[PDB]
Amino acid sequence: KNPKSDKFKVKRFHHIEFWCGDATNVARRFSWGLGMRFSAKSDLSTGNMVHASYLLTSGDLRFLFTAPYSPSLSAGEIKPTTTASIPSFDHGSCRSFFSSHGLGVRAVAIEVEDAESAFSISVANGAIPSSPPIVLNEAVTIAEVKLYGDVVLRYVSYKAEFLPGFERVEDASSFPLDYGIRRLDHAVGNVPELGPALTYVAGFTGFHQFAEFTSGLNSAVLASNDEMVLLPINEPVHGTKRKSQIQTYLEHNEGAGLQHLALMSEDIFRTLREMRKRSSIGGFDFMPSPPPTYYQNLKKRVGDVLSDDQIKECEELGILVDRDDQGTLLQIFTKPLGDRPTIFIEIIQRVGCMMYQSGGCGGFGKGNFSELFKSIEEYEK
Amino acid sequence: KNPKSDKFKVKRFHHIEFWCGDATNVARRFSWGLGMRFSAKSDLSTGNMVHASYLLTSGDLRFLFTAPYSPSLSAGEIKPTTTASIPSFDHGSCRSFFSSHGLGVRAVAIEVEDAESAFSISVANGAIPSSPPIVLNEAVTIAEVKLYGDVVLRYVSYKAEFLPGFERVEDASSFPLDYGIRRLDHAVGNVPELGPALTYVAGFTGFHQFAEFTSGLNSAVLASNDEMVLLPINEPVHGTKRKSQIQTYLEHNEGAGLQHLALMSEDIFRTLREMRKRSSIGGFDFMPSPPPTYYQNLKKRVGDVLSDDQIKECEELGILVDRDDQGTLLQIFTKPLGDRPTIFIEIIQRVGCMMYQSGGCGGFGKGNFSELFKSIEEYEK
Ligand SMILES: CCN1C(=O)[C@H](O)[C@@H](C(=O)c2ccc(Cl)c(OCc3ccccc3)c2Cl)[C@H]1C
Ligand SMILES: CCN1C(=O)[C@H](O)[C@@H](C(=O)c2ccc(Cl)c(OCc3ccccc3)c2Cl)[C@H]1C
Ligand SMILES: [Co+2]
Ligand SMILES: [Co+2]
Numbered sequence A, B: 001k002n003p004k005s006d007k008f009k010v011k012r013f014h015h016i017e018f019w020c021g022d023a024t025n026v027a028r029r030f031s032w033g034l035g036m037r038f039s040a041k042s043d044l045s046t047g048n049m050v051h052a053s054y055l056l057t058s059g060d061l062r063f064l065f066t067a068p069y070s071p072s073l074s075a076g077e078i079k080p081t082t083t084a085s086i087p088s089f090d091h092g093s094c095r096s097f098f099s100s101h102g103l104g105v106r107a108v109a110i111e112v113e114d115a116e117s118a119f120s121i122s123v124a125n126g127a128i129p130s131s132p133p134i135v136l137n138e139a140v141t142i143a144e145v146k147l148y149g150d151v152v153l154r155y156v157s158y159k160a161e162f163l164p165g166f167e168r169v170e171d172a173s174s175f176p177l178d179y180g181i182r183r184l185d186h187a188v189g190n191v192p193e194l195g196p197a198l199t200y201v202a203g204f205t206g207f208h209q210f211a212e213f214t215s216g217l218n219s220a221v222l223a224s225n226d227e228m229v230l231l232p233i234n235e236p237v238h239g240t241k242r243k244s245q246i247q248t249y250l251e252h253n254e255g256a257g258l259q260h261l262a263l264m265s266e267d268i269f270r271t272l273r274e275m276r277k278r279s280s281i282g283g284f285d286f287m288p289s290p291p292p293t294y295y296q297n298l299k300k301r302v303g304d305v306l307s308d309d310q311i312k313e314c315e316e317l318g319i320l321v322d323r324d325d326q327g328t329l330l331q332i333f334t335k336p337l338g339d340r341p342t343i344f345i346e347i348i349q350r351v352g353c354m355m356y357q358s359g360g361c362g363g364f365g366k367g368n369f370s371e372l373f374k375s376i377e378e379y380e381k
Helices: A023-034 A091-101 A115-124 A194-205 A245-253 A268-277 A292-302 A308-317 A367-380 B023-034 B091-101 B115-124 B194-205 B245-253 B268-277 B292-302 B308-317 B367-380
Strands: A010-019 A037-042 A051-058 A061-068 A104-112 A129-136 A140-148 A151-158 A181-190 A208-213 A217-223 A230-236 A257-265 A320-323 A327-333 A344-352 B010-019 B037-042 B051-058 B061-068 B104-112 B129-136 B140-148 B151-158 B181-190 B208-213 B217-223 B230-236 B257-265 B320-323 B327-333 B344-352
Touching: A010 A091, A010 A151, A010 A181, A023 A037, A023 A051, A023 A061, A023 B023, A061 A091, A061 A181, A091 A104, A104 A115, A104 A257, A115 A129, A115 A140, A115 A151, A115 A194, A129 A151, A140 A194, A181 A245, A181 A344, A194 A208, A194 A217, A194 A230, A230 A245, A245 A257, A257 A268, A268 A308, A268 A327, A268 A344, A292 A308, A292 A320, A292 A367, A320 A367, B010 B091, B010 B151, B010 B181, B023 B037, B023 B051, B023 B061, B061 B091, B061 B181, B091 B104, B104 B115, B104 B257, B115 B129, B115 B140, B115 B151, B115 B194, B129 B151, B140 B194, B181 B245, B181 B344, B194 B208, B194 B217, B194 B230, B230 B245, B245 B257, B257 B268, B268 B308, B268 B327, B268 B344, B292 B308, B292 B320, B292 B367, B320 B367
Parallel strands: A010 A061, A104 A151, A181 A230, A257 A344, B010 B061, B104 B151, B181 B230, B257 B344
Antiparallel strands: A010 A104, A037 A051, A051 A061, A129 A140, A140 A151, A181 A257, A208 A217, A217 A230, A320 A327, A327 A344, B010 B104, B037 B051, B051 B061, B129 B140, B140 B151, B181 B257, B208 B217, B217 B230, B320 B327, B327 B344
């Protein structure tokens, strides 16, 4: 069921913002490893004395990397005279975030039709305000509320090119990398308490429950009206023989935060060929591939969706496959993106649910816990 | 003249340590951009709960990238029970360094025959102690004194594989990149006051004056007995029409610090071909190339050292050339390595002074200030 109970008009995921120590090095690493182009900047060269922010894009996916300059560069500024392009930015908040959590997502940004209305309705329905609505150049409105931990849900609305004050980058510096990634499919948070987290977020958004799972975790997914904005949330389950991976996240992250970003590819085979070629030359590493027994068991589960040859390519690339009663899911997971065993990336491609493809087609891969475990045992033999 | 007045036995540059927010992303960016292999690690996977440290190597050049984990992981440790592999490391010092200066060099490490003796002699001759001599696994001794700003001169001595507690990395993760870089040639500091800086460092090392320069700066170079450890130091000169680039460094860096690392290549043409291919795909950018008038004037200055074809290759790659009465210097400069206009890298190759090649053969390029300026004017025409 979909009660379509959004309390304001939500469109799509807009961007993800990482708070960094050095935005330059993280942005360059991510650009090469994921095949994202440098598309906009806001920094000393654009008159911003407060923060360095670099925008990578691949299709509709937007990754923003931001780091603070020395506060001394802007010591004479006040908010009415700021040279910051993102008015919610604060040197102390950013340094405190990074000291506490390390490299990670500060903002999950969704485009809405009116960010001031979304903020007002959200706060009236229980959201904790983080940054009030600010109109940039009479063109864009931006506002932020707390989502979980020190992650904010950012609302962006456009009257009508990322944000005012950002400049398109020199095409000499803008190499047209593209490994096939096209949009953000979902963004997953880890929290200590799922119930209160869900009640809070669904309370102020009107997002509805899309999925739920009850090893080592409990999970539920909140969705917008057209189920294009998808926000899974996990909690640890204590008492299993193996320690909860969610608890390990919370320990190393110093609390709740964003666990993974799932990036939709229009050609997951090409995306993984390109990413795996670069893993050891500055790119991203991938989690260990499942045993050959996993791929032999794949024929019986999805042999009507994927040819043997396509299953063989999944095996070459370490790709996992899951399927519900409506669609089929191809997915794979990177190792953590930075020093701490916290945030990682998922590459996903979905098959089915054509009408456009409906959001969340095929689920989130929960069947792969069981099937991975079974394959583990079968391969040990 | 070389009075050979070193107060203890110094061998060669050993390594450079960067203090980072996220060591993983900086190390991966640098590996790809400079062609350095991942060769050792000390992190959670090696039992280090305190800091993440990754070692890149190219020939004899060693770059170490270190970042702190959450202090909570090691909250029960004391120094006698530490899991840190670098005993001088301190969470608060590292976070304070990075907040103040951004990404940059914390340690210039030189190998000596006895780090305890070097430390004791240095402090007895005026050095400010930073970390006392500590013996690691009865095999390596490490000690640190202040050099300038928050940069330390680190002494390392070996009884006889980087440091105990570091592990060689999986060869799957160790891609054998190599663009030709072979060793650290010199490491340059920017300070507010050159006189006191020189008196301090020469006072505790016995290093002698190798070179001196008196636009926008004054500079002098301190050298070890065999002039293989070379430490130029710059101060700003105020009052010129254009603002001192050294002063700009000091403002953005919040004080004195390391300005550039000059990396010797055994084939500067190959190094620059490889680095320039990667500038816009995660590597390093280079400063603007000199006008064609610079390279036409090169024939008259070094036409006995470099053929026309080799001069044409210098022009293709933006390489600068200088020459003294003893040798010839090929050099080029990157744009800043991170967000702030502070630290950058120089690639260098020296021709001449064969006997082995004597250190500092050809100087440091001071003739290129004048010749660049002249070329500037000639090209405007
Ligand atoms: C339970 C509800 N879920 C969501 O809603 C999610 O989007 C989702 C998901 O993507 C997913 C699906 C299958 C597996 Cl096997 C998996 O773990 C991989 C892994 C193990 C160890 C270290 C790194 C990564 C994940 Cl993380 C899942 C968590
Ligand atoms: C004066 C004594 N010197 C040393 O001892 C040094 O090693 C040395 C050196 O390497 C050098 C040589 C020629 C030039 Cl043109 C130059 O500036 C390039 C540049 C300009 C603007 C932004 C980035 C880089 C440098 Cl930095 C020099 C400073
Ligand atoms: Co997922
Ligand atoms: Co130099």
